[model samples]
Target: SMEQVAMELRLTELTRLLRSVLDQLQDKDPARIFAQPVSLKEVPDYLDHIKHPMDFATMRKRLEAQGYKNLHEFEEDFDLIIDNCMKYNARDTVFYRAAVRLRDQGGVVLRQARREVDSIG
Candidate 1:
């Protein structure tokens, strides 16, 4: 199915993106806490299994209200969520980990859409 193919492609790209981020942070992450690494293929299922806190939904709605204008704009909120989660050690909890995964998935989708829109305009 086309949707499945698209999803796989997006997941592959997301895995690449995640790996890049991890590499960039490796030097600063001397403790190697994040070195465990998430399985790219399992991210979607992991996200599906956990329930997000209300704050996650609130943040998404706020972003929507502000307008999804472009991938970069959406990513501001996305990065914020992930960064905060990492900062507070919230990522250790299932809920925040799932939230990060959800944001990552959405970011990939939005980025692809932005590219399409850019090419069309």
Candidate 2:
């Protein structure tokens, strides 16, 4: 069970890192749109433009499911959440602006832990 135990610990640290980013994101996000998926099917183009849709809930599930084996993987998804938003909407839209803000903040938090990779190992 060493591998299992080791994997559990990996997840514990991963969860902490993921939450650190989300905690701040949730605070700045008043609309809570990123908290879930962008499922308004009303916008006929919503699904058409976004091929790889990412959300906080989706990241949480991935983190819990061990989909992200390291911080790099987590960063990929984090960036996706922002990039997908920016891509779907124009820069003038609130959604695009919010994504920009979250990307900057989320990126800093991500950098904080990237340097701490030594501790995790």
- Cα error, residue 35 of model 2, in Å, equals 1.1
- Tens-place lDDT per residue, model 2, 1-121, is 9999988888788777766766766676678868888776676677778888888888888766767777778888878888998898899999999998887776677777788765766
What are the per-model C-alpha RMSD values against the true structure? 12.7, 2.1
Candidate 1: residue 71 lDDT (0-100): 43
TM-score of each: 0.38, 0.82
Write one digit per residue (lDDT tens) for candidate 1, span 29-56: 3443333433447554534543331233
lDDT of each: 0.47, 0.79
Model 2, residue 74: distance off in Å is 0.9
- The per-residue C-alpha lDDT of model 2 at residue 115 equals 81
Ten residues in a row with the worst lDDT in model 2? 18-27
Q: Of the candidates shown, which would achieve the greatest lDDT relative to the real structure?
A: 2
